[PDB]
Scaffold this active site. Structure first.
Site, PDB file in Angstrom:
ATOM      1  N   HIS A   1      -1.412   1.151   7.312  1.00 35.72           N
ATOM      2  CA  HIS A   1      -1.955   1.068   5.962  1.00 35.72           C
ATOM      3  C   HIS A   1      -2.083   2.462   5.364  1.00 35.72           C
ATOM      4  O   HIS A   1      -2.682   3.354   5.972  1.00 35.72           O
ATOM      5  CB  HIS A   1      -3.314   0.366   5.961  1.00 35.72           C
TER       6      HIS A   1
ATOM      7  N   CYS B   1       0.819  -1.209   0.000  1.00 35.24           N
ATOM      8  CA  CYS B   1       0.000   0.000   0.000  1.00 35.24           C
ATOM      9  C   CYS B   1       0.855   1.262   0.000  1.00 35.24           C
ATOM     10  O   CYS B   1       0.487   2.266  -0.625  1.00 35.24           O
ATOM     11  CB  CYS B   1      -0.945  -0.012   1.202  1.00 35.24           C
TER      12      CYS B   1
END
Ligand SMILES: COc1ncnc(C2CC2)c1-c1ncc2[nH]cc(Cc3ccc(-c4nc(C(F)(F)F)cn4C)cc3)c2n1
Ligand SMILES: [Zn+2]
Lengths: 519, 325
Positions: free
Chosen positions: B269, B4
């Site tokens: 994330h 990510c």
């Protein structure tokens, strides 16, 4: 903490300023002018047209820049602020230092004066303003040694200007804080924080009764403030660059301003359209002082970054952008600042270059000039005197005054060990030991100190520094501890102040006569 | 997939102006050289930097193909959306001495530096045998380090280059972007024990170390130091005339935000979001809206919903991007 031993290489009396002047003071009754030069020398001159060499006297007890001076008691006493973190009190009539207040933590930048109260105030980069009575300072000796501060606090940054009204009821401080801070000198209480400027302020003024204030900042803005209203009533834009000096007439009507742009203006506060370009100096204006022989001021003295000080007349009885003066009426010529220096490969001699590109050759060990070389090439002459022998660095050169100031630090003072035959000291028996340049120089500087005289000798035994050579003991950073001429070491007061001030790393060599050793 | 931190800045770079056509006309040269050597001996270290441009071009072609179908979750259709970032990340890791999650700003500067490196490597074979000023005139600018001797009030000027603008959040409560920009670019005063030696004054004086902006790139990248769960004000319009050398009215507008989810940056994330303007081809339906990228899922959200997702303390923003208006 760390103490360094410095000494000035100079002539006994320097008639002219070897550096620029930061402040001016005029004595009307005696026709005398006091120039506070950056060469740590306050010079008294005569302002008469009848004089061709108007030099009167010198006051050389300071160490670093002299930023502000104040006359007191019909011109009997003078008070000087300096960058050596000291405020000195001198006799203005006979030109000698009486006292040295070592109160400021940093540079002392400005002085405010009130002649009706005979009251003075000192301000500097230490964010503190100290109030003093003139008659209290004039009655000080080594016995009468009692005077502390009545400090004003609040400045969130360093101060650069200070001013008091004639009556002595209101004081104002200008800082790099871009805010004027007002205090009551009688009660020592914060009055107001005028929040108008956008840059550092370097000049302030007040009227007689302390009702209006003038301010000159480095933003090109002159500002007129009403005290009771706590607001700036006017902002004049007459300069291209920063405004550094301000003067006002007796009626508090016209403001005389100068600064980085050498143009000087006499602008009417009631109407800014009525301004006249007095003159454009050669160097940026540092300070000015008006002649008060008439309500229309006849002339004004200007002190710039250059060593010379000018006196421009004010006689309009043209129209456009014409400077009122094409050339000054009077000129007090100053010296030339030693701008560049180089130490030779033998670490024994020095090659200096002043403002006029005149190169000079010196012996830092003997502390004297060898010869003047004229307008020769500096680098070509450096490469022209090329001696191959290597010597370690054992000192440092300083030009904070414009003259040669040789400084010796404990870490590397005794690092130079040269051959006596190579050092030029010819012994009759053809001997050649190893000699420490730092130790020899320290013993030559303290040659006139009887505490070093051990049975009895006097000196290092090879050379003698000039007796007028000013020796200084100063703390690294800016603090100056003691100052005296070499021959002055014989005085009992100087001897005791040396016994208290001379550090141990100088005592163990000059008094104990021990070996310097390493590290 | 667990990439990510790279995918967010890749999606951000996709909507950067000039980046698309820039890498296209830069990869054209590499294809020309491939076929010219096919018809007619370089270093492998430069060859590795060459190949990532072709990899990026394949990636961008695939993203354009996926945009035409308006498929918002290709995880069930094409695994390529996840396999291509690994193809780029292997080459990136090979091109560096540095190091499942890492800094999203370090990878951005690294990709930009590698593109500039291959731009120089192609420059050295153009005039010896505009196009190669991609990273230099999109993200990199001209910083100025003038300091002023408060005594003589003289300015000494120095010039530098910069891509990112690292910026703190709080002091040592709701701070506007102006305060955070001042914390990075404003003045540090030199006064006290160690003063500044002025050559003009030949003396110890006070000084002012200040930063300034001389010539600005097409896109300003803003790094946000932190972890701190206290966000700040994020203005839409922006102008740097307050901290500029020559005050010019070149204003900028916010168009891309990279946000971090999770307190631990070790395995947090990264989520992306990009605004779309100047959609000249056809899509005015998306004009003004904000695309949000979370893993393989892209969504369309209104401006107010995204602005409320920023302000309260779930996911705090990590990178800001402002293009010239
Ligand atoms: C810019 O996306 C990337 N860029 C560069 N690398 C990547 C991948 C990380 C290597 C991506 C990336 N990441 C996650 C994704 N999930 C689904 C897709 C495919 C897709 C994306 C956008 C659209 C769209 N575009 C507009 C508009 F407004 F521009 F017209 C509206 N919509 C809905 C339609 C389909 C996708 N793509
Ligand atoms: Zn300076």
């Amino acid at each position: 903490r760390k103490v360094q031993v410095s000494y000035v290489i100079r002539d006994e009396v320097e008639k002219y300023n070897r550096n620029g002047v930061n402040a001016l003071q005029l004595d009307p009754a005696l026709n005398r002018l006091f120039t506070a030069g950056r060469d740590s020398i306050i010079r008294i001159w005569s302002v008469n047209q009848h004089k061709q060499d108007p030099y009167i006297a010198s006051m050389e007890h300071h160490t670093d820049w002299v930023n502000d001076i104040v006359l007191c008691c019909n011109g009997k006493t003078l008070i000087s602020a300096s960058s050596d973190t000291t405020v000195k009190v001198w006799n203005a009539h006979k030109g000698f230092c009486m006292s040295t207040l070592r109160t400021h933590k940093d540079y002392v930048k400005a002085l405010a004066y009130a002649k009706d109260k005979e009251l003075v105030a000192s301000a500097g980069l230490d964010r503190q303003i100290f109030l003093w009575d003139v008659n209290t300072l004039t009655a000080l000796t080594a016995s009468n040694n009692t005077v502390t501060t009545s400090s004003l606090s609040g400045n969130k940054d360093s101060i650069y200007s200070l001013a008091m009204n004639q009556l002595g009821t209101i004081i104002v401080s200008g800082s790099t804080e871009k805010v004027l801070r007002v205090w009551d000198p009688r009660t020592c209480a914060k009055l107001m924080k005028l929040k108008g400027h956008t840059d550092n302020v370097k000049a302030l003024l007040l009227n007689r009764d302390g009702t209006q204030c003038l301010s000159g900042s480095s933003d090109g803005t002159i500002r007129l403030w009403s005290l009771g209203q706590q607001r700036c009533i006017a902002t004049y834009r007459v300069h291209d660059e920063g405004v550094w000096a301000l003067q006002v007439n007796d009626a508090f009507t016209h403001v005389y301003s100068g600064g980085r742009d050498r143009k000087i203006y006499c602008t009417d506060l009631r109407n800014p359209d009525i301004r006249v370009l007095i003159c454009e100096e050669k160097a940026p204006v540092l300070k000015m002082e008006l002649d008060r022989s008439a309500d229309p001021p006849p002339a004004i003295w200007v002190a710039t970054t250059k060593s010379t000080v000018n006196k421009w007349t004010l006689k309009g009885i043209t129209n456009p952008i014409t400077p009122l003066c094409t050339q000054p009426d009077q000129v007090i010529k100053g010296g030339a600042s030693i701008i560049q220096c180089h130490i030779l490969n033998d670490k024994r001699h020095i090659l200096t270059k002043d403002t006029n590109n005149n190169v000079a050759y010196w012996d830092v060990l003997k502390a004297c000039k060898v010869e003047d070389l004229g307008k020769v090439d500096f680098e070509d002459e450096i490469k022209k005197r090329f001696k191959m022998v290597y010597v370690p660095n054992w000192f440092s050169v300083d030009l904070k005054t414009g003259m040669l100031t040789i400084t010796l630090d404990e870490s590397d003072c005794f690092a130079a060990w040269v051959s006596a035959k190579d050092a030029g000291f010819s012994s009759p028996d053809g001997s050649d030991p190893k000699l420490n340049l730092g130790g020899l120089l320290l013993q030559a500087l303290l040659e006139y100190w009887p505490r070093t005289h051990v049975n009895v000798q006097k000196g290092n035994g090879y050379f003698q520094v000039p007796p007028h050579t000013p020796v200084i003991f100063g703390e690294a950073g800016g603090r100056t501890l003691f100052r005296l001429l070499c021959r002055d070491s014989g005085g009992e007061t100087e001897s005791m102040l040396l016994n208290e001030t001379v550090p141990q790393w100088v005592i163990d060599i000059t008094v104990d006569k021990n070996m310097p050793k390493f590290n | 997939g667990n990439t990510c931190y790279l995918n967010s800045i890749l999606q951000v770079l996709y909507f950067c102006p000039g980046f698309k056509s820039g890498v296209k006309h830069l990869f054209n040269i590499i294809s020309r050289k491939k076929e010219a050597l096919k018809d007619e001996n370089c270093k492998e270290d430069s060859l590795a930097s060459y190949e990532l441009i072709c990899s990026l071009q394949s990636l961008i072609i695939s993203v354009e193909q996926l945009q035409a179908s308006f498929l918002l979750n290709p995880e069930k259709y094409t695994d390529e959306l996840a396999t291509q970032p690994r193809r780029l990340l292997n080459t990136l890791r090979e091109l560096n001495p540095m190091y499942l999650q890492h800094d999203a700003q370090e990878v951005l500067q690294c990709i930009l530096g590698n593109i500039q490196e291959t731009c120089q490597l192609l420059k050295k074979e153009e005039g010896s045998g505009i196009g190669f000023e991609l990273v230099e005139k999109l993200f990199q600018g001209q910083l100025v380090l003038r300091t002023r001797c408060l005594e003589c009030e003289s300015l000494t000027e120095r010039r530098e280059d910069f891509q990112d603008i690292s910026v703190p959040v709080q002091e040592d409560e709701m701070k506007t972007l102006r305060w955070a920009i001042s914390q990075f670019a404003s003045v540090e005063r030199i006064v006290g024990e160690d003063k500044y030696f002025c050559e003009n004054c030949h003396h110890y004086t006070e000084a002012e170390r200040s930063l300034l902006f001389d010539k600005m790139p097409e896109v300003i990248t803003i790094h946000l130091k932190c972890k701190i769960n206290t966000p700040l004000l994020t203005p839409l319009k922006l102008s740097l005339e307050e901290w500029s050398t020559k005050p010019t009215n070149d204003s900028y507008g916010l168009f891309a935000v990279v946000m971090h989810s999770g307190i631990t940056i070790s395995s947090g994330h990264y989520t992306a979001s990009v605004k779309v303007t100047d959609l000249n081809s056809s899509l005015k339906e998306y004009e003004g809206k904000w695309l949000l990228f979370d893993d393989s899922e892209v969504k369309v959200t209104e401006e107010k919903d995204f602005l409320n997702s920023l302000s309260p303390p779930t996911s705090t923003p990590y990178l800001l991007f402002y293009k010239k208006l």
